Design a binder for this molecule. Sequence first.
Ligand SMILES: O=S1(=O)CC(CNc2ncnc3[nH]ccc23)C1
Length: 167
Amino acid sequence: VNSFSGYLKLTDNVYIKNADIVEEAKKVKPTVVVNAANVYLKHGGGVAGALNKATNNAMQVESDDYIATNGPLKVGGSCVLSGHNLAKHCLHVVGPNVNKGEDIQLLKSAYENFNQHEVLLAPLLSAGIFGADPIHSLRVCVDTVRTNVYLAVFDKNLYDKLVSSFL
Ligand SMILES: O=S1(=O)CC(CNc2ncnc3[nH]ccc23)C1
């Protein structure tokens, strides 16, 4: 039993809710919140900008030190950093950004990072400003993640479309 509330069950291990991931993180304080990161961990907009703003820029400060030491992530890769006031840990995962021309096949690799964590609160990777089709992202999630994932979808209209079209 866990504290996630109001989710629709899609499969054995995937759950979905119309929610603001920032507000959901603030209330649940999950072990892991996933950030929709880029390779430079520059948290300017989308989910990343919102999560970072909620940490009063502490996520960005920590991220800049990470990059200065380790260099950029790979598209499809991830790193574990602090969850600050939102979660125990933040798993920064880089899905391909279609608006930069990155290969969508890397979306499966991106979701594979979730399998290293038993339970996660997450957005749909490569959705929103990353330019991928969220219906495809949900399909890849369901067919790749085997651990327990709670997906927060900010847009109510999109949420209803994802549920109604789910196979
Ligand atoms: O005030 S807001 O419209 C800003 C938004 C931030 N929270 C999100 N939650 C889940 N997926 C998301 N994708 C992009 C943002 C987002 C609530």
